[PDB]
Each structure stands twice: as C-alpha cells, then as structure tokens.
Amino acid sequence: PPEDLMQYEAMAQDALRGVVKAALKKAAAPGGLPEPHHLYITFKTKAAGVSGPQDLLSKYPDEMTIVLQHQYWDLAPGETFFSVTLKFGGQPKRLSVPYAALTRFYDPSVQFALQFSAPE
C-alpha cells in the first residue's frame, strides 16, 4: 500500500510534458533558442497522432530521437502537438508529434533532462 486513487504521479508526468511544449515555443520564437541551448526530443513512432514519411517511420519501429539545434525549419508548436521540418540524408521531411508521444527530453547545455510515459 497505499493505492493512489488520485494518480498523483501520473498527473505530475502530464504536468511535466508541458515543459517540453513551453520549451518548443521559445524555440519557435523568431531567432530560435538562446544559444548554446538545443533540444533532444525522443518519442514513440507508433503512438497515435504522429505522422511522417512512411519510409522514415518504418526505419524507426518504436523510438525515435530528433535534435533541434542546427537543422530544423518551421517549428510549429500547437497546443496538443508540434510539427517540424528536419533533414534525413540531406532530404527535408515533415513530422508531427503529440506531446503525449514524448518519452524523453534533454538539453545538453545545462544537462536538464525529463523522462515520461514511464510509471516505473
């Protein structure tokens, strides 16, 4: 015991996904992130809501990390999901990721990290 009927831990997890969303809004601001800040976003490829080139998604069965630093365009962070253009083998491609699909967040500059979808 004791069984948590309030699911405080789950609510704290969702609350924290919001930091990713807030960080992506500063990154979407004209001028981008304040250097040397950059982001590493890891998400579940099969999670509902995520869209991307069929070829690309097939390459990454479950997890996929993307880095937002030197090569990303048109970052559009909506209220429930964000979309961005990145390059794979020099080829630009679009991605849409729900904040719900997120599993990890990391900014190497200040070593700040977050881990989600993990109830442990």
Binding site: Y60, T65, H70, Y72, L86, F88, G90
Partner: peptide, 10 residues
C-alpha cells in the same frame, strides 16, 4: 542521445 535527423553545424 542518438538523433535520427542531420545535425552538422554550418
């Protein structure tokens, strides 16, 4: 880490 997208600085 292990990013999937290209990230070489310029």
């Amino acid at each position: 880490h292990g990013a999937a997208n290209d990230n070489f600085a310029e």
